[PDB]
Amino acid sequence: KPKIITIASIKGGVGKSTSAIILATLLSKNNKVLLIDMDTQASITSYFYEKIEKLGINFTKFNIYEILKENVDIDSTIINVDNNLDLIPSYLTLHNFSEDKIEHKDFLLKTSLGTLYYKYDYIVIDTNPSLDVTLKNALLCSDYVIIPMTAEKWAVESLDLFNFFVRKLNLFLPIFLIITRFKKNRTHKTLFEILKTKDRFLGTISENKDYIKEYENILEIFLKKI
Amino acid sequence: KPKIITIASIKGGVGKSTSAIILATLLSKNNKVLLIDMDTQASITSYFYEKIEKLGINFTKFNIYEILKENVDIDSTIINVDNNLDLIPSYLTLHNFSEDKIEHKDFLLKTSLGTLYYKYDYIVIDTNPSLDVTLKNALLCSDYVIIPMTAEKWAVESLDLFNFFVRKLNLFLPIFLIITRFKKNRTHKTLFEILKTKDRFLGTISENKDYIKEYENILEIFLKKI
Ligand code: NA
Ligand code: NA
């Protein structure tokens, strides 16, 4: 069975989707990885758009929302975008999902992944920065959550809120933390000193490169802790 | 009765909240204006946070979500932040709203504003870039919508989607358009040539200042057209 990681944040602008791309890409080097763009903003899909255009994929018809609606089969949406890196793209129609009236709505992605799953070692799911039914679908499939967060007003309260949300879903779902946009010269490192003592704190990403090496480090620590 | 303007976009990163602040601030110069932050990300509230801290307001207890939940009275949340500019702040707890089970949920803001309204000439409501029940609450109170949008993949499709959403609410709600981050040197001005022929197209904002003057222009055209 694949290990399923949701990349989440209920704050926008914390490099959620960047983290998802990079961690997934790193995992793809020695594992088979599916990346699922479940973000209405579709940043991961935009990042790979060039490659998707070259293959002439109709992601208007073949996308995560059309899977959730059971209008297409999951396998027909899967796009190879890098070596050992497959992608299910998002499209703006995902915006309707929260309003669609559907039975057993929370379990639609869990159902769909079950028909597939076994081809993959990891599934990394990128979600909207909202507590909504799209997120619940991700969380109910997942084994782990990684939250990239930034030193900001209300960061710990936001984290508490997200945690509350997970419990009220009735999940026992471990959440691992990264501080992104990390400012080594910051005067009051108030988030770092709160988070650093937590067992699931992975590390910081500074505000071929030294960027990727910081992610490799985070990833190494995560894979060690799980 | 106040004229109620929802500032919306289902794409993030188009200066939705910046537009809301600036248009509202301009309207406040010769009118009494209430700004409502109904965005889970709370950018307008962050913008005014300094002023809110100086007044020692507990926006943990007194905020738009607590109004929607009927735990506090609207008037007890209102914060004066500039001359003729009042503010109802947002807080991260707004994230739970989409999941709260509540009767006549779509009309909660409309109900709350009715107990107040009459003190104001304009109410400007900033919303999340999501099609959800928070947005519906805004739209059902509104007389007009202004959408600041950017030259991007899927812009016209996103606009179509938003329009579909408004009709399915059963509203006859005019939508006015701005292109923000406008690049006068752009090679293919494909959005501008589509939008420029529409009667509700207000104009462009370029990527005391010349910035405010472009907004004044947009605002003048809007007030002329309505
Ligand atoms: Na939605
Ligand atoms: Na929500």
TrEMBL record, chains A, B:
Residues 3-168 form the AAA domain. InterPro entries: AAA_dom, DNA_Partitioning_ATPase, P-loop_NTPase. Gene3D superfamilies: P-loop containing nucleotide triphosphate hydrolases (3.40.50.300). Keywords: Plasmid. CDD domains: ParAB_family. It comes from the Bacteria. This is PF-32 protein. It comes from Borreliella burgdorferi. The gene is PF-32.
